[PDB]
Structure formats: C-alpha cells, structure tokens
Amino acid sequence: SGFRKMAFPSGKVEGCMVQVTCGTTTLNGLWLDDVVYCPRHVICNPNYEDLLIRKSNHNFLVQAGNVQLRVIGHSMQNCVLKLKVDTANPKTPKYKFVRIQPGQTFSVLACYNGSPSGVYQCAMRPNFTIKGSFLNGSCGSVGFNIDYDCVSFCYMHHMELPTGVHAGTDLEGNFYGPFVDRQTAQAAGTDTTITVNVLAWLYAAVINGDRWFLNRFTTTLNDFNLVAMKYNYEPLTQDHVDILGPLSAQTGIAVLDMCASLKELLQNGMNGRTILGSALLEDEFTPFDVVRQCSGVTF
Amino acid sequence: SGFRKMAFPSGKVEGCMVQVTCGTTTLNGLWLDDVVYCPRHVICTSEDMLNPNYEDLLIRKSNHNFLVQAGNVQLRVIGHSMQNCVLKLKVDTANPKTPKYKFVRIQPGQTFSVLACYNGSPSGVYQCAMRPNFTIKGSFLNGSCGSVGFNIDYDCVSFCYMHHMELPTGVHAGTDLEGNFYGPFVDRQTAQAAGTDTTITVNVLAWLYAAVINGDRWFLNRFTTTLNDFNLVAMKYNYEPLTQDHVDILGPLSAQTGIAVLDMCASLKELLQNGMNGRTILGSALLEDEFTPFDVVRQCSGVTF
Ligand SMILES: CNC(=O)CN1C[C@@](C)(C(=O)Nc2cncc3ccccc23)c2cc(Cl)ccc2S1(=O)=O
Ligand SMILES: [Cl-]
C-alpha cells in the first residue's frame, strides 16, 4: 500500500556528473564516454559561434570529483556544448538520448558544482516548462527515466523563468517550448492540467481503496472534453483512453466511467475530502508510473 | 525558486542492496563491509507470524540456509547473529561499494529518503517523515521488507530505518539499523493498529517560513500568541504540541525572514481557523508537515524574496 511521488534511483546518473567552468561561469556537465555535455551558455544578445571560436581547449575546466579532466576538443549542437575529454568515464551507463512529450514525467538529479544534492520527480507541463526546484548553479543538471538497464536522458536544465518555473533542452540542445538561451522578456504560456494523468491518479486512488468519488454514471468523450476545456484541462484523446485500458481492466472501472467521476470533481469539488492525501487533483503521474508503482518494477 | 519534496541521491545506497532468501521467503538486505543486515522475519513462514519464537527458529538454521545474491554474484554466508529484530549475516566478501556510513535512530518529525527495493533490486526513491505515531506513510508492496531509509549529510550516509511490516491501515513500521522498532510495534502478526496521528507542527511552521522566503506572505497577520495559547488551539486541530526546543530550532528561519516564531504561530492559528479560502501556499492546498527546519534551510536560498 501507499502512493508517493517517486523518482527513479539516481545512481547511474550520479557517476556522470562533472563540474564545468569557463572563466567566471560555473555549471554542471554530463560525462558520457569521452564527452562532457553542458549548456552552451557556459562560454558567456549572444553570438555563440563568435564566442566559441575565441575559446581554447584549456579555457574549459572540467572537474570530476577531485580529479581534473583535460579538454581536447569542443563542438556545439544546438544549445548544448560538447567537450571532448581526454579520458572516457568508467561509470558510463547504458544510455539513450530521448525527446519526451508534454505530459510525460521524469526524475531530476539537481546538482551544484558537479555534485548531486537531491533527486525529485516532475512532469513536462503542456506549456513546456517544468515546476522544478532549482537555485543558481543548477544549470546542466539532467532529467531522466530508467526503462530496463537503459537511462534515457530527456532534459538538461538551462534557466528559470520570472514566475519560478524552469526551462531546458533535450540532450541534443533543442529547447522544450518557445524559449531561447539569452536574457530577454520571455514568460511561461498559460498552463493546462494533464487530464490523462489526473485520471491515472484517480485509478491509483481506487487501487488503494479510495472509492468515494465514483458514481453510477458514465459520459462520452465529446461531452467530457467540452467540460474539460472549460476548466483549463488538456483535451482527452482516443489514444489516452486506450492507454488507460490496463488500469480500467485492473480496477473494473471503464475510462468513461472515471471521466464522469472527474467531471463531478471538477464541477462541485472535493467537499472537504482528500484523494490520496491531496486536496488538489494531481497531474504528475502518467498511466505507466501508476502501473509501475502498483506492480513493483525493479532496475 | 521552486520548492519540491526532494529525496537524497540514492546512489551510495543502491550499491548496498542485496537479495536475502531463507527457504521460501525472499526479502532485501543491506550489505555493509562483510555483513548483510535484513529483518529477522525472513526465517518465518506465514504460520510462524502469529506467534514466532525467533531464537528457536534461528538455532535450527545454518549459514548455507541463507542465500544472499548481490547482482548476479552469489554471496557465501559464514556466520549469523541477531540484534533485536534484525538478522546480521557475516558474508565471506566485503562490499567494495561500501559508502561512509553511520547508524542513527531518528525521532518522530525527522525526514528521510527511502530506496524501495524488490529482490535486492532498487525500483524507486522517495522522501518521507517519521510520523508522531511512529509509522511512515510509505509506498511498499510485498517483497519490499529490508528496504532502507537514510539521510546523506556530507560524504556520510546515516542509515535510520529498515522496513519490516505494513499495518492494517496501509501505513508502515520498521526498525532502526540495530533492529529496535520505532513505536510499540512488534514483528508478530497480532492485533496492532497505528495510534492517532498528529500534524508535525514544527515542520508546518518551517514550511510556512519557506513560503515567506519564496515571497508568499498572504497568510501573515498583525497578531502574535503565547506558546501555551498556541498549543491549546493546536491540540484542537490534532497538531503536535510545540515545545521550547522547537522554537529555538526555528530561530534561523525567524531571523532570516524577520517574523518571530510566535508571530508565525499566530498565522498558523488563523490558517487552521479559516482554511486557505481557495489560495495555495507553495503550490499546495494542505499545510505540509514533511519538511523539517533543516530540510527548508538545505533547499531554500539564504536570500529571502
Ligand atoms: C498487509 N500486511 C500484512 O499482511 C502483514 N503481514 C505480512 C508481513 C511479512 C508484512 O507486513 N509484510 C509487508 C511489508 N511491507 C509491505 C507489505 C505490503 C503488502 C503485503 C505485505 C507487506 C508481516 C511482518 C511483520 Cl514485521 C509483522 C506481521 C506481518 S503479517 O504476517 O501480519
Ligand atoms: Cl532525529
């Protein structure tokens, strides 16, 4: 029993965190094989092609623990700097670089000075920002999932927006959302609630014996989406319904049965009650996260 | 900016998780130096759970009856002792990834990270607090016994909890790393239920100071209170009594924000009285009690907003 927000074990990622210093800037880097990946703003209206051509190999100080790493090459892929190091990382795990979609969750290993300080789980919001916990010097700290023996790296931290939300790139340097890596007037767009995740969390509540929100009623996909659009909820697609199939089967509550229960929670509220110890409807647990936490999947 | 419930990096603990099997039962073990620590109920069947005689069951077991598996490698048991509710298996090889560690007994209110494992394989990490009733609201399915709770302060992993059982209400009970249970729980299948739980008041106040540090001041007021008058109101809402020790501990946060501890107690008294009225403090619609004053200082900047 019990339902918690659970990050993946950060162990295979901790062995990859190094500290990158270029002049006055000091951020974190990801050491995979003979390459260290970090935000391209470490060299810093910027002209990165012009700033980078002026930098020598020894102008980058990569420190892995107490050992000092020697930079022997440097290239740039989008908003990520790739520093060819003289030594390959002995603790390099099995990895993939993946681009996740808004709604999908991941673990973040928050680091400062190439030293990991904490791990937490979060979701890529529909507006492309992440509600993370970052202070100055956290740039370069990565987001990941572990599926089997493979660490799929999905996010690299770049910046904090005026409202306290965060923006970063995939491991190829492509930003998530309309953000650019420079100091300009940029703000987070209007956010929506990830509907497929709220439903998955309602299924986890029933799996844990919380059934107060259920009712005899059902609804249709269109009638539910009209109501959801009014409460700033992401539209629920036929793909979403199919994905909630294993949970619908395990609990015996049809996806459109659960949609009628959500419609009612959205209309009249919790009425002083809590679902899984929460007074808000949680949207940072994907249907796979729910299945994985209520099965016992190990790595 | 941003305030999240944050577990410690589980890396130094992952390298210590092994799988312990005795007969038909299979749980997790903690491999430190040449010793594997695990719950003693590993030597029990389901029948033995009603009234077990652990000394009588243990005397019948030899080293080769324990199958410790670390990854793919099979570990050889060369000795076995018992300290309270934990079994200590002397293994033939010392763990090469043994981190710098301490065994600590935490007090109700204190927080820790849990590395949930199944078959000596870690599956997830999460942060939780030792509740005033001595249980933990964790996420544990069958096969997770022997999963541990820890804090990492500097290069040291202080092990504070080992998971043993789940109570009828879905809450969890375990021992310190010396096998001494937290609370009046016993490793027996008997009629035992979690006592009435209360809200950790010192932690709610710490979390209210973390909200002021992040520029959330809507809940503050022009009132103060005496420690006794606050506790009389707090008991009515099932809150833990605030002690003079608690006030002293909140000193740095009181100073950093410029809000006296009893000033914040007045805002908490009013918050309990009125509710949130549709507002949220640090993105939450409930008052959070699983962030200690030490966790707030560790996560939050020294520069108030
Ligand atoms: C649902 N809980 C139970 O039926 C508890 N019983 C089994 C057991 C082994 C126990 O608690 N095992 C579990 C631990 N954590 C999590 C669990 C989740 C699911 C199922 C068992 C879980 C045990 C251990 C001790 Cl120390 C005392 C009594 C008992 S017991 O025989 O009463
Ligand atoms: Cl303590």
Given ligand 1 and candidates B114, B161, B165, B188, which is best to mutate, with the most ligand atoms within 8 Å of its CB? B165
Q: Is B165 in the pocket of ligand 1 (CB under 6 A)?
A: yes
User: What are the structure tokens assigned to B258, written together?
Assistant: 């410029």
Report the chain A residue with the minimal C-alpha distance to residue B303: A135
Yes or no, beta carbons of B123 and A299 under 8 Å apart = yes
User: Could you say which of B176, B197, B218 is where a domain stops?
Assistant: B197
Residues A117, A240 within the same domain: no
Phi, psi at residue B208, to the nearest 5°?
-70, -35
Residues 6 or more apart in contact with residue A98 via CB below 8 angstroms: A145, A152, A153, A154, A170, A171
- For residues B27 and B36, the answer to whether their CB atoms sit within 8 Å is no
What is the spatial distance between Cα A212 and Cα A193, in angstroms, rounded to a whole number? 22
CB of A10 within 8 Å of a chain B CB? The answer is yes
What is the spatial distance between Cα B240 and Cα B254, in angstroms, rounded to a whole number? 20
Classify strands A94-97 and A150-160 as parallel, antiparallel or unpaired.
parallel
Chain A, residues 139-178, CB within 8 A of chain B, namely 160, 164-166
Residues 6 or more apart in contact with residue A85 via CB below 8 angstroms: A31, A34, A35, A36, A62, A69, A70, A71, A72
- Domain of residue A32 covers 15-93
Residues B105, B242 within the same domain: no
Of A41, A97, A30, nearest to A64 (Cα)? A30
Chain B residues within 8 A of A297 when measuring between CB atoms: 123
Residues A70, A111 within the same domain: no
- Largest Cα–Cα distance in chain B? 69
Chain A, residues 58-97, CB within 8 A of chain B, namely none
C-alpha distances in Å from residue A299, one per residue of B38, B119, B123, B125: 20, 10, 6, 12
What is the spatial distance between Cα A280 and Cα A284, in angstroms, rounded to a whole number? 12
Residues A24, A9 within the same domain: no
Matching residue, tokens 């790296």:
A153
By Cβ distance, the residue of B1, B121, B170 closest to A164 is B1
Distance from the alpha carbon of residue B108 to the mean position of ligand 2, in angstroms: 7
What is the spatial distance between Cα B183 and Cα A37, in angstroms, rounded to a whole number? 48
Rg (CA), chain A: 22
CATH number at residue A244: 1.10.1840.10
- For residues B172 and B135, the answer to whether their CB atoms sit within 8 Å is yes
What is the spatial distance between Cα A16 and Cα A152, in angstroms, rounded to a whole number? 13
- For residues B255 and B304, the answer to whether their CB atoms sit within 8 Å is no
| Residues across chain A | 299
Residues A6, A81 within the same domain: no
Task: Read off the DSSP letter of residue B288.
Answer: -
Residues A98, A3 within the same domain: yes
For the CA of B188, the closest atom of ligand 1 is: 27
C-alpha distances in Å from residue B5, one per residue of A108, A224, B284: 12, 33, 12
Q: Apex CA B110: angle with CA B108 and CA B112, to 5°?
A: 125
What is the spatial distance between Cα B136 and Cα A58, in angstroms, rounded to a whole number? 51
For every residue of B35-59, DSSP letters joined together read EEEEEGGGG--SGGGTS--HHHHHH
Of A129, A135, A100, nearest to A189 (Cα)? A129
Yes or no, beta carbons of A279 and B285 under 8 Å apart = yes
What is the spatial distance between Cα B122 and Cα A10, in angstroms, rounded to a whole number? 10
List strands edge to edge, sheet with A60-64.
Answer: A67-69, A60-64, A17-22, A25-32, A35-39, A80-85, A71-77
What is the spatial distance between Cα A244 and Cα A103, in angstroms, rounded to a whole number? 14
What is the spatial distance between Cα A257 and Cα A285, in angstroms, rounded to a whole number? 20
User: What are the structure tokens assigned to A220, written together?
Assistant: 């249709």
Of A16, A30, A44, nearest to A170 (Cα)? A30
User: What are the structure tokens assigned to A98, written together?
Assistant: 């993946």
C-alpha distances in Å from residue A241, one per residue of A78, A176, A293, B215: 36, 26, 20, 40
Mutation pick from B3, B4, B142 vs chain A, by most beta carbons of A within 10 Å, is B4
Mutation pick from A66, A91, A119, A271 vs chain B, by most beta carbons of B within 10 Å, is A119
User: Could you say which of B152, B182, B197 is where a domain stops?
Assistant: B197
- For residues B134 and B184, the answer to whether their CB atoms sit within 8 Å is yes
The beta strand positions in chain A, using DSSP E, are 17-22, 25-32, 35-39, 60-64, 67-69, 71-77, 80-85, 94-97, 105-112, 115-123, 142-147, 150-160, 166-169
Of A17, A19, A148, A169, nearest to A95 (Cα)? A148
Matching residue, tokens 């703000």:
A187
For every residue of A251-299, DSSP letters joined together read HT--HHHHHHHHHHHHHH--TT--BTTBSS------HHHHHHHTTT---
What is the spatial distance between Cα B159 and Cα B178, in angstroms, rounded to a whole number? 10
Q: How far is CA B52 from the centre of its chain?
A: 27
Q: Is B187 in the pocket of ligand 1 (CB under 6 A)?
A: yes
Four-residue CA torsion sign, A217, A218, A224, A228: positive
Residues A168, A217 within the same domain: no
- For residues A9 and A146, the answer to whether their CB atoms sit within 8 Å is yes
What is the spatial distance between Cα B101 and Cα B156, in angstroms, rounded to a whole number? 5
Residues B164, B132 within the same domain: yes
What is the spatial distance between Cα A34 and Cα A243, in angstroms, rounded to a whole number? 39
By Cβ distance, the residue of A119, A277, A296 closest to B141 is A296
By Cβ distance, the residue of A2, A279, A295 closest to B170 is A2
What is the spatial distance between Cα A62 and Cα A85, in angstroms, rounded to a whole number? 8
- For residues A182 and A148, the answer to whether their CB atoms sit within 8 Å is no
Of A39, A27, A29, nearest to A81 (Cα)? A39
Residues 6 or more apart in contact with residue A241 via CB below 8 angstroms: A221, A255, A256
What is the spatial distance between Cα B219 and Cα B208, in angstroms, rounded to a whole number? 9
Residues A163, A255 within the same domain: no
User: Could you say which of A93, A110, A143 is where a domain stops?
Assistant: A93
Matching residue, tokens 């990158």:
A20
Instruction: Give the side-chain half-sphere CA count within 13 A for B110.
Output: 16
The amino acid occupying position A5 is K
Yes or no, beta carbons of B2 and A277 under 8 Å apart = no
Residues A100, A186 within the same domain: yes
Task: Read off the DSSP letter of residue A57.
Answer: G
Report the chain A residue with the minimal C-alpha distance to residue B7: A119
Chain A residues within 8 A of B280 when measuring between CB atoms: 280
CATH number at residue A148: 2.40.10.10
For every residue of A119-155, DSSP letters joined together read EEEEE--TTS-B-----TT-TT-EEEEEETTEEEEEE
Of B107, B102, B172, nearest to B138 (Cα)? B172
B145 included as an active-site residue = yes
Q: Could you give the number of structural domains in chain B?
A: 3
Residues A37, A182 within the same domain: no
- For residues A213 and A248, the answer to whether their CB atoms sit within 8 Å is no
Residues A60, A136 within the same domain: no
Q: Apex CA B144: angle with CA B141 and CA B148, to 5°?
A: 130
What is the spatial distance between Cα A38 and Cα A91, in angstroms, rounded to a whole number? 18
Method by which the coordinates were obtained: X-ray
Task: Read off the DSSP letter of residue A165.
Answer: -
Q: Is B167 in the pocket of ligand 1 (CB under 6 A)?
A: no
Yes or no, beta carbons of B139 and A293 under 8 Å apart = yes
Of A181, A173, A179, nearest to A46 (Cα)? A181
Among protein residues, the one with the nearest Cα to ligand 1's atom 23 is B165
What is the spatial distance between Cα A235 and Cα B110, in angstroms, rounded to a whole number? 41
